[PDB]
């Protein structure tokens, strides 16, 4: 396309809602991060309050000393896995046939617990759901029960076949992202009709650059405590950054607050509020009843 037309009747949630119910909006891509799992009690470490250098998350420091990470994963391992309204909102996109993909930075598996399938989902920074023996000639797969027993056991996970470290299938800082990230990205962004960016300040690459892969005509909604993805005034000096505010704004909308309240309010414009109220209440209760 490469031509910057305005398909949104206005730059609001209401504008996006009408667009979302137009015949033109059929393929929706969500980009999510830690902001959508904070109300589940998983902290984000770039939040000023309740946030944590980043050696723990770096791969070189993991290799030498794997123990710091595992001792923390324990601290942070949640008692219950209860997806949020923001997640169940993405489940509604799926069921209603709008969800092309959810591209997530989180490793918490909550997208899957809300009922997104592998096909719907790009765990760009991997996940805890499965773990693998790091030994190249082994690569034995272990599930979260096992990995959790080790973590909560406070025993460093060792492969039962070769005794090499068993690492959670998460991508560390310094590591390459999974290959499907790029194969999906190259296909998905050709025919996306709406970009739904939720609970990420977009300060991790290459993830952050996904917004620029969107055609210049795709509307982009941000749901977040603060604005993000605007081009830096100095690095811009050396494309497709967010524009909520300039006079050349035409497709970017910021809804600032909690993702659970934004997704709730967006559902209300769409006439989904009840479904979403039922779903969350029923899935939570189902989880409460394990």
């Amino acid at each position: 396309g490469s031509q910057k037309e305005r398909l949104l009747d206005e730059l609001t949630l209401e504008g996006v809602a009408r667009y979302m119910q137009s015949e033109r909006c059929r393929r929706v891509i969500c980009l999510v991060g830690a902001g959508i799992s904070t109300s589940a009690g998983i902290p984000d470490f770039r939040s000023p309050s309740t946030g944590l250098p980043e050696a723990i998350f770096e791969i070189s420091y993991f290799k030498k000393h794997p123990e710091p990470f595992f001792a923390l994963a324990k601290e942070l391992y949640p008692g219950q896995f209860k997806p949020t309204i923001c997640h169940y909102f993405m489940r509604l996109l799926k069921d209603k046939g709008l969800l092309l993909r959810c591209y997530t930075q989180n490793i918490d598996t909550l997208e899957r617990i809300a009922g997104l399938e592998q096909e719907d989902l790009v765990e760009a920074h991997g996940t805890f759901y499965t773990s693998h023996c790091v030994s190249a000639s082994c690569r034995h797969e272990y599930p979260l029960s096992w990995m959790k027993e080790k973590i909560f056991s406070e025993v460093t996970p060792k492969c039962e076949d070769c005794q090499s470290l068993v690492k959670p299938d998460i991508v560390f800082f310094g590591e390459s992202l999974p290959a499907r990230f790029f194969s999906c990205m190259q296909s998905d962004f050709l025919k996306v009709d709406l970009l739904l960016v939720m609970g990420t300040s977009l300060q991790v690459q290459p993830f952050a650059s996904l917004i620029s892969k969107a055609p210049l005509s795709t509307p982009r909604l941000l749901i977040n405590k603060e604005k993000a993805g605007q081009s830096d005034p100095f690095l811009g000096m050396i494309g497709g950054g967010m524009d909520f505010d300039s006079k050349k704004a035409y497709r970017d909308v910021a809804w600032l607050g909690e993702c659970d309240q934004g997704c709730l309010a967006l559902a209300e414009l769409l006439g989904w509020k009840k479904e979403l109220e039922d779903l969350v209440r029923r899935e939570h209760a189902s989880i409460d009843a394990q």
Partner: peptide, 6 residues
């Protein structure tokens, strides 16, 4: 590229 703060 590779996961990194930027």
């Amino acid at each position: 590229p590779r996961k990194q703060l930027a």
